């Protein structure tokens, strides 16, 4: 009798179920009001009901809950100051997907040492998200799989499906059942169609496999997500400018989906140079001053300290993509608030 099962598996280890973390860290009354309201505010932006700019801003990845909370405290002041022009939501992404060998993020490997203490990682992810909402800072994240949302999606005000998963049927099915609005990124080489197609798909009811909150194999039946939009994040060429926004809006309309979209200032639009994010934001500011009617949001990679590092030596400095630092963050946000004030007054 020859073996055929789990030939290339080292082990399969059962995790604590979502309900265990939910019981210790239940969503508070206050956090629930913030999440519910922020989801609605974002829906309003996606559908053109409000002309504030959604700003998804924060670290490329979270590797240190302390620095994340300090960052949130600073950002909250600006979220409040600019609340009439900008809707500021913090980036709380636990991982950056990659092709080469590297750190697999705070959920999978919280101790940053290849121990893969995932129960600890999931608990800390949830705890950080609860603390953020409790202080008044809504949180955004990317869902890379169909199981992690059960642990903490209740704390998430906006979700992303990245460039590498926007075309994936199962990630579209997930999005169709996410409680938050969802942005779909264009493809890594610039393909917009996959994201336009994703919005249409995700608006419908789907099924996908996952686990129940008690941790048991399950099929989820979704209602459809009416609050999806595209995210322009560059490709072979950047796609942040007015001509690209116009072309995207035309294609969105031709597909019968929302022509309000988000522009990522980072990643392929900055050509991985954090100092380009301000130049992208300047371009967006000019678009908002002139017309800019199809822009509902921007994404920015921002941390306490600018740049990046291979090892987590400097506090508040990214170990994944390079970020703008705090002073630049202040200037970028001022810029976009000033420009959108003018758009909103028209």
Ligand X SMILES: N[C@@H](Cc1ccccc1)C(=O)O
CB burial string 121-146: b at 16+ within 10 A, e below? bbbbbbbbbbbbbeeebbbbbbbbeb
Residue 321's binding partner among Cl ion, Mn ion, its own copies, none (Cβ under 5 to 8 angstroms by kind) is Mn ion
CB of 145 to ligand X, least distance (A): 9
CA distance 64 to 61: 9
The reply on whether position 58 binds ligand X by CB under 6 A is no
Q: Which of 60, 137, 220, 245 binds Mn ion (CB under 5 A)?
A: 60
Whole-number Å distance between alpha carbons of 174 and 226: 13
| Beta carbon nearer to Cl ion, 202 or 343 | 202
Return binding residues for phosphoenolpyruvate: 91, 96, 163-164, 185, 233
Considering only 70, 117, 321, 330, the residue that binds Mn ion (CB under 5 A) is 321
Kind plus residue range of the DSSP H or E element containing 262: strand 261-264
- Breaks in the chain after (C-N > 2.5 angstroms): none
The smaller minimum CB distance to Cl ion, of residues 197 and 291, is found at: 197
CB of 306 to its own copies, least distance (A): 27
Residue 321 engages its own copies in binding (rule: CB under 8 A): no
* Residue labelled with tokens 């130049």: 279
Binding mask 197-236 for ligand X (x = CB under 6 A): -------------x---------x----------------
Q: Which is nearer to ligand X, 140 or 340 (CB)?
A: 140
Among 41, 44, 64, 154, binds its own copies (CB under 8 A): 154
- For the bound state, the minimum distance from the C-beta of residue 81 to Cl ion, rounded and expressed in Å, comes to 25
Q: Which two tokens stand for residue 53?
A: 């700019």
C-beta of 22: minimal distance to its own copies in Å?
9
First to last CA, the chain: 76
CB 87 within 8 A of CB 57: no
Any contact of residue 221 with its own copies (CB under 8 A)?
yes
> Which residues, 180 to 209, sit near its own copies by CB under 8 A?
187-189, 191, 194, 197, 200-201, 204-205, 207-209
Shortest distance, CB of residue 209 to Cl ion, whole angstroms? 13
- Least distance in angstroms from the C-beta of 12 to ligand X: 5
Candidate residues 9, 113, 310, 311; the one interacting with its own copies per rule CB under 8 A: 9
Among 7, 9, 12, 219, which residue interacts with Cl ion (rule: CB under 5 A)?
Answer: 12
* Number of Cβ atoms within 10 Å of the Cβ of 15: 13
Q: Are 303 and 324 in contact (CB under 8 A)?
A: yes
Cα(194)–Cα(198) distance, rounded to whole angstroms? 6
Listed as own residue / partner, the contacts of 97-101 with beta carbons closer than 8 Å and 24 or more positions apart are 97/144, 97/162, 97/164, 97/165
Q: Interface with Cl ion includes 175 (CB under 5 A)? A: no
- Angle, helices 326-345/276-290, rounded to nearest 10 degrees: 10
Closest CA to 64 of 115, 101, 114, 112: 112
Binding positions for Mn(2+) are 60, 267, 301, 321
264 counts as binding ligand X under rule CB under 6 A: no
What is the radius of gyration, based on Cα positions, of the chain? Answer: 19
Q: What is the DSSP letter of 324?
A: B
Is the C-alpha dihedral spanning 78, 83, 84, 89 positive or negative?
A: positive
How does strand 182-185 pair with strand 207-211?
A: unpaired
Footprint of its own copies on residues 79-98 (CB under 8 A)?
A: 97-98
For residue 237, what are the CA distances in angstroms to 55, 60, 132, 180, 267?
23, 21, 36, 30, 12
Residue ranges at the known binding site: 60, 91, 96, 163-164, 185, 233, 267, 301, 321
Stretch that binds Cl ion, among 37-45, 133-141, 188-196, 331-339 (CB under 5 A): 188-196
Taking the complex as a whole, the smallest distance from the CB of residue 79 to its own copies amounts, in Å, to: 19
Site of interaction with Cl ion (CB under 5 A): 12, 99, 160, 162-163, 194, 197, 212-213, 233, 267
Site of interaction with ligand X (CB under 6 A): 5-7, 9, 12, 146, 149-150, 153-154, 177-179, 210, 220
């Amino acid at each position: 009798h020859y073996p055929t099962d789990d030939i290339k598996i080292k082990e399969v280890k059962e995790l604590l179920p979502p309900i265990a973390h939910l019981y210790e860290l239940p969503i508070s009354k206050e956090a629930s009001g913030l999440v519910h309201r922020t989801r609605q505010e974002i829906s309003d932006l996606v559908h053109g009901r409000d002309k504030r700019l959604l700003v998804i801003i924060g670290p490329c990845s979270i590797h240190d809950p302390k620095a994340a909370l300090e960052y949130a405290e600073r950002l909250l002041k600006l979220r409040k100051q600019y609340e009439n022009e900008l809707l500021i939501v913090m980036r709380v992404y636990f991982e950056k997907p990659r092709t080469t060998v590297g750190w697999k993020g705070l959920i999978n490997d919280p101790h940053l040492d290849g121990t893969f203490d995932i129960n600890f990682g999931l608990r800390q992810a949830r705890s950080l998200l609860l603390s953020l909402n409790n202080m008044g800072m809504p949180a955004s994240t990317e869902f890379l799989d169909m199981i992690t949302p059960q642990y903490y999606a209740d704390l998430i005000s906006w979700g992303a499906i990245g460039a590498r998963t926007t075309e994936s049927q199962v990630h579209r099915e997930l999005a169709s059942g996410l409680s938050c609005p969802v942005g779909f990124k264009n493809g890594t080489d610039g393909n917009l169609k996959i994201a336009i197609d994703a919005i249409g798909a995700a608006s419908h009811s789907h099924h996908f496999l996952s686990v129940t909150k008690a941790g048991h194999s399950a099929i989820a039946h979704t209602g459809g997500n009416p609050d999806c939009h595209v995210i322009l994040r560059g490709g072979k060429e950047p796609n942040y400018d007015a001509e690209h926004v116009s072309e995207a809006a035309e294609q969105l309309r031709a597909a019968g989906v929302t022509d309000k979209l988000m522009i990522d200032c980072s990643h392929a639009n900055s050509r991985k140079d954090y100092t380009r994010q301000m130049e992208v934001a300047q371009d967006i500011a000019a678009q908002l001053e002139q017309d800019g009617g199809n822009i509902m949001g921007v994404m920015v990679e921002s941390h306490l300290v600018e740049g990046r590092q291979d090892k987590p030596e400097v506090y508040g400095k990214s170990i994944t993509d390079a970020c703008i630092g705090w002073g630049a963050t202040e200037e970028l946000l001022a810029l976009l608030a000033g420009a959108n004030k003018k758009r909103m007054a028209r």
